[PDB]
């Protein structure tokens, strides 16, 4: 999930208004990518035996 795209898509004013909210969506990018990377660790764990 592209954070800035979801909350403030196509708006420069909104993008500025989100950087004042710290780095929440950095974690959201981190968490879902952490989920996505683990998905490979799932399939490789069971099938690449």
């Amino acid at each position: 999930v592209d954070c800035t795209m979801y909350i403030c898509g196509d708006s420069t004013e909104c993008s500025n208004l989100l950087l004042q909210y710290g780095s929440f969506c950095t974690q959201l990018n981190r968490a879902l990518t952490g989920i996505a990377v683990e998905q490979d660790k799932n399939t490789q764990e069971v099938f690449a035996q």
Partner: protein, 49 residues
Amino acid sequence: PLSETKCTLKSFTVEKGIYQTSNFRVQPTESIVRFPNITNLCPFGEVFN
């Protein structure tokens, strides 16, 4: 792109792997305006005077 990954990770060195980054988006080339062309003005003169 390598220095943009450096920017994203806040680190002067980046380890081997694959890294997310701000997505690309083709910008609008020009502008389009589509009003219904209409002659008569609104009767604000009659509204006010």
